[PDB]
Write a protein that binds this ligand. Structure first.
Ligand SMILES: CC(=O)N[C@H]1[C@@H](OP(=O)(O)O)O[C@H](CO)[C@@H](O)[C@@H]1O
Length: 355
C-alpha cells in the first residue's frame, strides 16, 4: 500500500497527533497491520481481510462486545479508536479498516525464551477462558465457519491436493502423505463436541504466543491482542494451538529442521499456568485430551499451510514462494516429536491434575 493511500486512511480516524509515518508491522498472517507514528501517541492500523472475514459488521460487533466488557471490568484490552464520525471501523474504497491504540511498555515473543514466559502465557490464556465463560454462546457469532473443525479442514486439504493447481504436489509427497495418513485422528474433538462429551465453550481460537503482550518491566501479561476469532469452541482449541506455536524450540517458519523440537518442559510450564487457572472447570475428558490437542491443532494448522502452498498461497501472507512449505514442515516435525513424547506429556498433565 502506498503512503499517500495509508495517510489517507489514517485521516478517517480520530487520531490525536499529526501522523509522521505508517509502516507494515508485526507477524499476523491474515490482516494487514501498520504502526502509525505521530508527533504524539502511536496507533495500530489494520486492514481487515474481507475474503476471510466477510461479515465485517458481525466481526466488529464481537470485538466491540469483548473489549467493552473488559473495559467495564477495568481490564486492559484493545482500544478501538473510532472514526471521526464515531464508527468503530471505516469502509474506504472497498477496504475495511480499524485503528487500535498502541499498547505501551510491552514486549512480545515469537519464540519462548524461558519457561516462565510460557507459564505466564498459559496463565493469561487460562484466565481469558474464565472471562469468556461469562458470555452466552449466542452473544458471540462465529466469524469464520468450521474454524477448528479439523475434518472440514481435511476436506479442504484433499480438494487442494487433488486440484494440485500449480503442480506443487510432486515436490512435497512426504508432507502430503503425513496428513493423509493421520486422517483417522482429526475428528476426536469435533466428535466429542457433537455428542456432549466435551463441553462447548466460548474460546479465543488463535492463542499463539505473539497474540499476548507482556509488560516490559513486570513480565506479567498486559493484554490479549487479536480478538477476531473469539467464538464457541473447545478449551482444547486454545490449549493445543498455544502448545503448537509456543512449545516449539523454533520459529513457525524455521528453515532448518534440526532446530525444530517439541519441548516437554515448555509443555509443562504452559500447562501449569493454564490448568492453574482452569482447575475448577476442566473436565476429565478435557484433561485426557490435553496432550493430543497439541497434535491436533499442529496438524490442523500444518495441513492449512500445506493446502495454501498447493493452492498458490491465497490464504496466509508469505515472503517467498516456498514459505508455506517451510511452515508445514516445522508443524510435521513438532507432531513427530509430540507422538514420540506422548507418555511423557500424559504424565505431565496427570501430575499437574493434582493442585
Ligand atoms: C483467521 C485465521 O485463519 N488465523 C490464523 C492465523 O493467525 P494470525 O494471528 O492471523 O496470524 O495464522 C495462524 C498460524 O500462524 C493460524 O493458527 C490461525 O488460525
Amino acid at each position: 500500500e502506498s503512503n499517500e493511500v495509508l495517510f489517507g486512511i489514517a485521516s478517517h480516524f480520530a487520531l490525536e497527533g499529526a501522523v509522521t509515518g505508517i509502516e507494515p508491522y508485526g507477524d499476523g498472517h491474515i490482516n494487514t497491520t501498520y504502526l502509525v507514528t505521530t508527533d504524539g501517541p502511536r496507533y495500530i492500523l489494520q486492514q481487515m481481510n474481507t475474503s476471510i472475514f466477510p461479515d465485517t459488521v458481525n466481526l466488529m460487533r464481537n470485538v466491540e462486545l469483548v473489549t467493552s466488557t473488559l473495559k467495564a471490568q477495568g481490564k486492559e484490552t484493545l482500544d478501538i479508536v473510532p472514526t471521526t464520525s464515531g464508527a468503530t471501523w471505516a469502509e474506504i474504497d472497498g477496504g475495511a479498516w480499524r485503528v487500535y491504540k498502541f499498547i505501551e511498555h510491552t514486549v512480545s515473543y515469537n519464540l519462548v525464551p524461558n519457561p516462565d514466559v510460557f507459564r505466564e502465557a498459559g496463565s493469561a490464556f487460562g484466565d481469558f477462558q474464565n472471562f469468556l465463560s461469562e458470555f452466552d454462546a449466542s452473544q458471540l457469532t462465529e466469524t469464520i465457519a468450521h474454524f477448528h473443525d479439523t475434518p472440514h479442514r481435511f476436506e479442504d486439504f484433499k480438494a487442494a491436493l487433488a486440484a494440485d493447481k500449480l503442480g506443487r504436489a510432486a515436490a512435497c509427497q512426504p508432507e502430503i502423505d503425513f496428513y493423509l495418513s493421520h486422517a483417522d485422528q482429526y475428528a476426536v474433538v469435533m466428535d466429542g463436541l457433537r455428542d456432549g462429551s466435551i463441553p462447548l465453550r466460548v474460546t479465543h481460537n488463535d492463542t499463539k504466543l505473539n497474540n499476548i503482550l507482556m509488560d516490559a518491566t513486570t513480565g506479567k501479561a498486559r493484554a490479549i491482542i487479536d480478538l477476531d476469532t473469539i467464538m464457541p469452541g473447545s478449551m482444547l482449541f486454545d490449549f493445543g494451538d498455544s502448545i503448537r506455536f509456543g512449545a516449539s524450540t523454533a520459529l513457525e517458519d524455521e528453515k532448518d529442521l534440526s532446530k525444530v523440537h517439541f519441548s516437554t518442559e515448555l509443555f509443562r510450564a504452559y500447562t501449569e499456568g493454564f490448568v492453574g487457572e482452569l482447575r475448577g472447570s476442566i473436565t476429565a475428558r478435557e484433561a485426557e485430551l490435553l496432550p493430543f490437542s497439541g497434535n491436533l491443532l499442529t496438524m490442523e494448522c500444518g495441513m492449512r499451510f500445506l493446502a495454501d502452498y498447493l493452492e498458490g498461497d491465497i490464504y496466509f501472507a508469505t515472503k517467498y514462494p516456498e514459505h508455506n512449505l517451510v511452515r508445514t514442515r516445522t508443524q510435521i516435525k513438532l507432531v513427530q516429536e509430540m507422538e514420540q513424547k506422548a507418555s511423557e506429556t500424559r504424565a505431565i498433565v496427570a501430575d499437574i491434575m493434582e493442585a
